[PDB]
Structure formats: structure tokens, C-alpha cells
Symmetry: D2
Subunit: 325 residues, 4 copies
């Protein structure tokens, strides 16, 4: 039987006898994802370039901004949210009381900034929490560890557009059919391969690597047990590198260095959702000192080192990292 | 004022007083590329999954290019990564151009959904005899045109001819390639280096040393950023757009390289050179290699002129 | 704020505290409609004409397959009646839900070649009998409808959805594959200035129809004559009547003495949209929604549209009986 | 063998040894039609409705045809239904063609989502005088090309030249017009009549009687069916594919009809005659009327030859 995102989550929520708020939230997010995807593929660009004589110029917003406006407005209008956090805004957004719902959403609306003009894959990252404080909604309601996530996932705008959705029961992948604006379930209950043959990180920072990271990269290029060396792949858009990690197995790293001794990626709307997806797919995601989902944040925009992927590959890193204490 | 690929090639062709054949070829090619793009973006994937109750992409893409070029009446010999021998166009559909192409580069890659693309090179048939596979065996310097479609976050067609390089963005709302970057010239020096560092075990000493200079620069300029998508069209297009260098060098475990000269290296070398960049094997300009096999491999180092010269300077050292 | 049909229906179902079966059905139907729309607009026809080399299914058949399969897999239906199928389709026990659905999947395939508007009409009933599901479950009068409407594949693709609360109009934005709410709680004009019917049957008309048409062309009260429009595709003609007002007629004639259009999946849904939007829909003898069907493909006369216009016709009809 | 409009028109032009200007005009025109089609199908309408937190469609359509034709370098005078005066292309862009068009016909009824259409007629400029509105005052006999795009269930482009009539279906997945019917001919006698019978009180006695013969055939044959969409493109296209007759004749409020000669009646009369049909005002063939005003009106009765002839017989009976 064919299944669409909207239908599949509708049925799953019926089973759980939930209130239908999470389902509304997801549906609204999917609409935003379809609009962002249409914009990323440059629908209408000919009007930007004067096909009508440059009387017709949204449309003129940059994709960062449009993407953020779409997720914001769509989540606001889902009636399912009360506090929203984006890489685009300094302070958490507090939803109009008439629109307030029970969920808290942290999201990167368009990950892949140094990378749109070259046309590499970009994505949307999201993580969804429930409001736990009894207080008025405020920035504090977004300061929860990744372990409190009810749902996280991402949309990858690559050669095709895919939405990966993780909840505590597992991870599902939905391919967008652009001919009908529907997310087709193509892979239920995904699990990451136990050990992969790809390592992923920016090696240009080699001069700033911790010696534990320097050694782990060495072990993949010159295996001590004379096993075959891993292959290297680094897209530089975190949504693409993590998805490849999910689908082919292996390891992805943005560890701590000099330009960022706490890593570069943000905990609430980059690191936590990829950790949540990975753990629920049978993978790992560590800062080196702990599980990413256990870091209790104090700033919605705080960074964190992240090392994730196939569990055997992350354990191996963890061994090399203990050895350097 | 707005322009489209087909309009632009049509006026540039009329200005040069040619026969229209190359314009026909490229328009047929454009149609194939838009149909490949549609399949890569997975239009109609819901029917494959039983929404109403059979080829993989690379076979489909080869058929799209093969057929669109045969019926253009502009070609005589067509070489594809997908076919062991050259396809000779049947006599009634024969034109004077030879096309070598990769219909869909990116294979360890479709299933993880990162950028794929079509690469192509167009040679004019010199000889007056019956077309054969020999006619595709020309150096890249004889290229009349070359380029690539990148099915990235959006679909872009890059077209290099003798005059220069132009970039056309596909607007899927109307299915037109829109001219967005005219007479593109690559940065003289870039800040990104691109290669699979998993082969460090097998690198020739010069690569090992040149890479080290990117990580620990001998003039205390900042290290280069590293980027490697694993899809040559994506890596080469980023190189053209932001500058820097792309390397698929001869390791000692395939001393001729991995990428294919006629339909991966030569087109990318042509695009680089016509945009003021370079592309070398280490021993000569990629475009100067004389081929003996339509499927032969070459090592490739291309990108910004100062970056390629720098790798070459290291390369001469190691002799 | 912006609203989509998926969000709107979902939010309305939550307030109403229903079980979600209707919402599920409506989500499946919307998905099938987007796929019919894509095929009707001929996306991919290059492949039919050999773009990939020397080389599937009529639009009629594919459209029916799309509605059939999406409704079956919604788990919300038990009996499905289609213009395309001689017999009512009985849903497999393991995918059976509460709802009976009667539909024309592609209304107007005698108009596909000339490329004019086609459409999908649908009416949704709660299964009423407790018997094993069968054709009889589709024989309810239109009064019993819980939801009805159509999709118009015209210059753009619209979906009109009627429930007991009223009529809403959704525009398909094909860039995102989302049905966007553009008209909330629409109501037909009290009186229109257009009349719509195939006047080529004039030789076979009843004297009532004959007199009513004359009043439109030569108004005894010397006011301006009505304009005439007739696409010959019911979804297009009914939709114009909704948005612009007036009257649409497909009466019986001597050659088709029970009428031409079909009661279960053309007249009843259109009558339901019309009544829920403040209009009327009659056979002349009774309200269309009050006819008790006996056969799933039976035909009915219909005269529908702006209330003043239908009442006028009925005044002409009563004079002649 | 598959064919697209651009390839087909281009190959035909090679064979006729033309300058290529007409090919370029038509390609420009095709691109405008794909852009009008996208807008008519409401692509992007969600953004107008607040999805991210209002030029009339036919004004945007006019801008698209205007701008693509100006920048084609094939035109010099543009006459649109949307514009009071002829538009004069700027000197540096002037080509040799005059184009008369309705950018979005039936578009005062876009609200009912009925079919809309684009109608066009392409003339060769006849004098060397500074371009002016007088260059559009040619009789339809002088047409080099004419046709229309129908924005209906699908988008179709119908293109009439001297050789005949071809129908191209737009595949929106790839933005190509595919040749689906070559050298179309209207059938000799039809069974549909099309006109607004709301005008019955003001009809010419010949129109009253002719239509009465459609409903009550004196040879006791089967009556015709009636259809009237109210968008000329849809009514004429159905007349073309199914045969029959379409009427917007003269009467009271209109001794010269309501439809306009240059960009409604002439292109449709040209399409009809190239398909073997007819198109009359009653007194003269539509294509022979010499216009004096770019917006002047003409009565029109067109379609299958047997049917138009039968109308003219009733018409002469009342003359
Ligand atoms: C991993 C997994 O499958 N989790 C369950 C998915 C799920 C759970 C709960 C919801 S909900 O609370 O937002 N929606 C819900 O309960 N909807 C509903 C649907 C149909 C009928 C009814 Br009465 C209620 C969503 C998804
Ligand atoms: C015109 C009008 O407003 N009619 C009422 C609309 C309506 C729509 C759907 C239903 S239902 O039977 O399908 N119930 C339903 O969807 N419930 C529900 C509950 C909790 C979560 C969800 Br996502 C859905 C009833 C009435
Ligand atoms: C009726 C029919 O069969 N074909 C239309 C004939 C036609 C079309 C276009 C032109 S042109 O004026 O634009 N000239 C042209 O296309 N020239 C051309 C094209 C390609 C190669 C060459 Br060498 C020349 C004329 C006639
Ligand atoms: C680099 C640059 O800036 N320009 C060269 C581009 C180019 C493209 C096509 C051709 S060509 O060989 O194909 N020449 C024609 O096509 N001429 C033509 C003739 C009649 C009608 C039409 Br329509 C076109 C030559 C050069
Ligand atoms: Mg980011
Ligand atoms: Mg290859
Ligand atoms: Mg029907």
C-alpha cells in the first residue's frame, strides 16, 4: 500500500490516541518544506531576471530569509506551538496567545550558507519538544536537553527532496513527489549500518585538531590492522553529510578546535536533532565527553562539538579520545 | 534584458553564420537535461509506489541523451560512459558532430541524494570517411563546445565555447534555462581544495606535499577549507564558482587516474580553460592528451590558475 | 492567516471531536486529485511521444485507478461507486471503514480532445445499513450526504468542498502541491444573469423548459436578456453558476426521458454544493437530494443555481403541469 | 521520431533558407506562453495568501509577451488588446516582424476558471518607413504566421503557417511543446454550433433562421449540439478538433460585431483557412478586410466549410 506523510502520521496518531496537535504541527512543517523546496529549485527565477520586464519583483528575499519566514508563519499558524527558536533570530519567538499550542520548536530553516551559490545540497533541521514548565511561555521553555525530544528530523534539498522524521519509535524517510506535492513513504524504520567505510569532516582545520581527532583521522587513512582505509566525503552542508552517514553508514565529525573550542554547530537546532535521528536509527552522537542528547543547554544559540554515525565508528573515536586524557 | 539558452545560442549562431547544426544539438541536449532533472527530482515517484495500484535513473538518462541527440540530425558518433562502444548514428539522421557524454555522473550517490549531473563534450568530425569510434579519439583542444548540467539544490547548465563560459539556471516553473552569469571567469586564486583524502596511503609524494601546504601554508596565510562532495560535477562547479582546486590524481593504485578523459576530464578541462582556469594531468594540459581508448582514464588537477600552478610547481620538484 | 485544506479539515475535525475517518478520506481524495491534475495537464507526455526512445493508459482509466486506490487505502470506505465501473466496488474487509463514496473520476472525457475543463465529482455518505457492504449502500438520497464537492481542472485546479456547515473553495498551488483556502463559506447570488444548457435539444424540450428559456431571451418584464454559457462539462458549468450566479439546466427530453446526467455522482453532489451555498437544485417534481435512488447509474433531470432563478423556472414548471 | 516546437520550427527554417528571425520570434513567444501558463495555473499563489507571513493576470501576460517579443530582436511594432496604441520597439531592438496579439483572451472570465488563451498574428513589416501603427494595418491575407495557446485542461499551442496547421502540447514537467498533431485539417461538416444565444432578441434575421435550422433541421436530420464557452480560444479550438461552426456576427449594438479584427478574428481566420475551413464576416472573408483602426471590430463566422457555406446561403437569402 502507498503511503503519504500526512496519511501515515494521521494513522500513527490515531493509534496513540494523542490530541492531534503533533500531527497538525508536522503537516504545517511539511507545507513549509514544500515551499522552501520549490524556492531552492529556483521556481520563478526567470521573473527575477526580467522575463516580464522587471515590473514584478517574497520573490526578492534571499533564501535564508524566505525559508525562515515560511517555517515561522506555518508553525505560528499551526496552533500547535508556543516558543520557536531559529538560527535567524537572537531571541526565541513567543507565539501570539490566540495561536498558542503546547509544543516548542527549534529549527535551522536553511542549513548550508556558504553553499547556495555553488548549488550544493541544503536542508531544514528541526527538533520538537513539549512545553514542560507551567510558567508563561518564554525562552526558557526551549532550554531542554535532546532527551526530551518528541520528534526531530530534517528535509534534505539535494538531487531530490527528502524528509527524514524520527520519533521515539524509529526513523522514517519520505521522498517528496514534486509532481503532486506529496511526501511518499519510501523507507520505514530505518537503521544505520553498524560500521561504515566513510569519515566526514573539514580537514582544512588540520592545524587546529585535538590530538585525539588527529589520531582518529590517521587510523582511517593508515589502518593499524592493515584493513582498507576509509573513503572521505565532506559536503560542508550538515544536512547532506549526516543523511549520507545515515544511509551509507560511517562517521561525521565537527569536533572542537581553535576558531571554536566548543565546536561550530548549534546544540538546539543542529546537533540535537541529528543526534536524535541517529540514536533512534541505532547510531551514536557524542561531544566526546557525553551524549549530545544529555547536554543541558543554558543558551539557545550555544555550540557543541559533535561526532556521530555508525556506532562502531563512534565507539572507536571514543576509545581514541579516552586514550588522550 | 532577460535571455534564455536557446535564444542566446540562436543569436550567437546567426551572428557567426554557421549552419544551425550546433544550435540544434544543444537544444536537443537541453530537452534531455530538463527531462533528466525531472526524473532526478523524482517527479512521478508516487506512481512507482502504487498511487494508482522500470529503469533506474542512469539507464533512463542515457536513453534521453542518446535519443535526443540521434533525432537532432546533428551528430554522427556518440560516446557514453554507459556503452562499451561508440554508437554510430544511422545514416538518415546523421549530422557532423561527435558527442562524448556521461549521462548521469554520480553512482555511489543517487541513493544518498547528493548532487549528480550530466557532462558532455562536442567535437566536430574532421575526416570525410564513414563515421567510426575513431572519430571520438580527438584531443580536448578540438572541442567546439563542452559543459555540464548539475542537478544540485537547483539545476544549472554550464556551457563553454571558444568565446567563453556561460551559466544558465533552469526555472522549473516554465522549463527554460535562464542566462544568469555571462562570460564567467574563475577566481585567479581560491581558498578551497577538493579531493578524496582517503587515498592518502597511495598518494604520489607531490600530492602529499601539496596537500600539506593547503593545511600548513608556507606564507602563514590561512589554511584552505576542504570540500569533497564525491560527485565531480558538484565539486567542479563549486571550484568554478568559489575558486580553489579539485584533484583526482593518479595514486599508485591506478596510475592513470580514475576519471574518464573523453566525457569527464576533457569537458571539465575545457570549461576551466575557457574561464581563465587550468586543468593538468601533472605532465601536460588535459586538453592536449591524445586518446587511444574512448574509455581511458586520466588524472585531473583543475581550478584557479594560481592554485594549479602551485600544485604543478610542487609536481616538478618531485622528479 | 493562510490555510490549507489539510490543515483546515484537520482543525475542523478536531473541534467536532469526530474519529478522523472523514479527514483521512478527504486527505486521500485530495492526493488523488493532485495526481489526476498532474496527468490532465499532461506532465510527462513527452515520454509517451518517445523522448527516451521508441514507445500507456487512458486518462479515464488512470483517474479512476487513482481515486479507487487512494480511497481503498484510506481505510475509511467500504463501498465505492464510479462512473467508470459497471458495478459498485466493495472494499476488502481488512481495509473497510464507515464511508460510502460515489464519484465521477474524470467528468468530461468527451471534452478531453478539445482540451476544455474536465473535473472530478464526489459525494460521501455514512454507510447506513448494517448489512454486509453492497451496492444498496450507495442508494441513499442526497439528503443523507455528509460531504460532497468537485475538483475543476480548468485554467487552474480548484477544489470545492461542501459539508453541512457550508461550502469552501481551495486553489491548488501546483508549485507546492497544496490546496490553498481562497473562499470561505461561499454563497450563491440570490439572482443571476446567465443561463446554461444545451439548447440543441430544443426540438425535444418540455413546454416548461421551452417557455423558461424564452423568458431569458425575451424577458416579458422588458429587462435585459440573460447571457448564455455552456461548456458542456458539468463541473465547469456548475462552477460558473456557483461563482457568478444564475441557472444550469440539463432537463429530461423526449429522447432521454429520465434525464441525461447521473444522480449518484453528478446531480446529487452538485445539488448538495448548491443547497449548502444557498441555492437550489430540483427535478421540477422534487429536490434532487430527495430522490430515492434505485440504481447506481440511474439518471436524473436537474435545474440548479441561484434561488430566484430556480424558483422562476419552477413557477414556469407549475403552470405547465 | 519525437519533436519539439523549437526543433521542428528550426528544421523547417533551414529548409526554407530564411534568416532565422521568425524562428527566434516564435521561440521568444513560446517562452512567454510557458510563463503565462505557469501564472494561469496559479503556481506560487500560496505566497499571495500569506504562506510566508496583485497585478491583473492579463496585465502580467501582456508584459510577458511584450518583453519577450521586444527582446527577441525580431519585432518592430506590437499591437496588443491590452494597449491603447501600437507599441514601437526601441531602435536597437527592431526586427522585421509586426505582431498583433491578445495576451490573455477570455480573461474577464478568469474568476470562473474557464479556459483562457493567447492569440497572435505575425506580419512582415511592409514599408521601410519609421515603424508606426500603420504597419499593423495589413489584411490577414498578409499573415506570415498565426495561432494561439489554449490554457485549458492542458496547455496547447496551435501554429498556422503557409504550409498548414500544427498542434503542440506543452509538457509542463520539462517546459517543451511536443508535436502531437501534424498538418491538421478541420472536418468538412460538423455537428456543433457555438454562439451566445443571449443576444437572440437582437439577432440578424439570417442568424435567427440559421440557428433555427440547427435546432430543427428541415430535412428532418439530427439537430446539432450547442456549445459556447465564452472564451474565443476554447470555442475555436473545439471547432477545429471536432468541426462545426462558431459565430460572433453583426447585429444592433454591433454592426461590425464585438470581436476585434487584428488580434482575434484574423489569427483565427488564418488558422481556419490553413486547416481547410472558412471564416467570413458575412460580406467578405475575414482575411481580406483591410483594417483602418488597430482596435477595429469585425463580425466573424468560422469553422467547417460546409457549415460556413450553409450560413452564407441563409445570409444571402436575407441580403
Ligand atoms: C513513532 C510513532 O509512531 N509515534 C506516534 C506518532 C504520533 C503520535 C501522536 C500524534 S498526535 O498526538 O499529534 N495526533 C493524533 O493523535 N491524531 C488523531 C488521528 C486520528 C484520529 C484521532 Br481520534 C486522533 C501524532 C503522531
Ligand atoms: C463543515 C464542517 O466544519 N464540518 C465538520 C468538519 C469535520 C471534519 C472531519 C471530521 S472527522 O470525522 O474526520 N474527525 C476528526 O478528524 N477528528 C480528529 C481528532 C483529533 C485529531 C485529528 Br488530526 C482529527 C469531523 C468534522
Ligand atoms: C510552414 C513550414 O513548414 N515551416 C515554417 C517555415 C519557416 C520557418 C522559419 C523561417 S525563418 O525565417 O525564421 N529562417 C530560418 O529558420 N532559417 C534557418 C534555420 C536553421 C538553419 C538555417 Br541554415 C537557416 C522560415 C521559414
Ligand atoms: C561562442 C559564441 O559566442 N558563439 C558561437 C556559438 C554558436 C552556436 C551555434 C552556431 S551554428 O553552427 O549552429 N550556426 C547557426 O545555427 N546559425 C543559424 C542560422 C540560421 C538560422 C538559425 Br535559427 C541559426 C555557431 C556558433
Ligand atoms: Mg546552519
Ligand atoms: Mg561517470
Ligand atoms: Mg461523467
Amino acid at each position: 500500500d502507498v503511503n503519504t506523510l500526512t496519511r501515515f502520521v494521521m494513522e500513527e496518531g490515531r493509534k496513540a490516541r494523542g490530541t492531534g496537535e503533533l500531527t497538525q504541527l508536522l503537516n504545517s512543517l511539511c507545507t513549509a518544506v514544500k515551499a522552501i523546496s520549490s524556492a531552492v529549485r529556483k521556481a520563478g527565477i526567470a521573473h527575477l531576471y526580467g522575463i516580464a520586464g522587471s515590473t514584478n519583483v517574497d520573490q526578492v528575499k534571499k533564501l535564508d530569509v524566505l525559508s525562515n519566514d515560511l517555517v515561522m508563519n506555518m508553525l505560528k499558524s499551526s496552533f500547535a506551538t508556543c516558543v520557536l527558536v531559529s538560527e535567524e533570530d537572537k531571541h526565541a519567538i513567543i507565539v501570539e496567545p490566540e495561536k498558542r499550542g503546547k509544543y516548542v520548536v527549534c529549527f535551522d530553516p536553511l542549513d548550508g550558507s556558504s553553499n547556495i551559490d555553488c548549488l550544493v545540497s541544503v536542508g531544514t533541521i528541526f527538533g520538537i519538544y513539549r512545553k514542560k514548565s507551567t510558567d508563561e511561555p518564554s525562552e526558557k521553555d526551549a532550554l531542554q536537553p535532546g532527551r526530551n525530544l518528541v520528534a526531530a528530523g530534517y528535509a534534505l534539498y539535494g538531487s531530490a527532496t527528502m524528509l527524514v522524521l524520527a520519533m521515539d519509535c524509529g526513523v522514517n524517510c519520505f521522498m517528496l513527489d514534486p509532481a503532486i506535492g506529496e511526501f511518499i513513504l519510501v523507507d520505514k524504520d530505518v537503521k544505520i549500518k553498524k560500521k561504515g567505510k566513510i569519515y566526514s569532516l573539514n580537514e582544512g582545520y588540520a592545524k587546529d585538531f585535538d590530538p585525539a581527532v588527529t589520531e582518529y583521522i590517521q587510523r582511517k587513512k593508515f589502518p593499524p590492522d592493515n584493513s582498507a582505509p576509509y573513503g572521505a566525503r565532506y559536503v560542508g552542508s550538515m544536512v547532506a553529510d549526516v543523511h549520507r552517514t545515515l544511509v551509507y553508514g560511517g562517521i561525521f565529525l565537527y569536533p572542537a578546535n581553535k576558531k571554536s573550542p566548543n565546536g561550530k554547530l548549534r546544540l538546539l537546532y543542529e546537533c540535537n536533532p541529528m543526534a536524535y535521528v541517529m540514536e533512534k536509527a541505532g547510531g551514536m552522537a557524542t561531544t566526546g565527553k557525553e551524549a549530545v542528547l544529555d547536554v543541558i543547554p543554558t543558551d539557545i544559540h550555544q555550540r557543541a562539538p559533535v561526532i556521530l554515525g555508525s556506532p562502531d565508528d563512534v565507539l572507536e573515536f571514543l576509545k581514541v579520545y579516552e586514550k588522550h586524557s
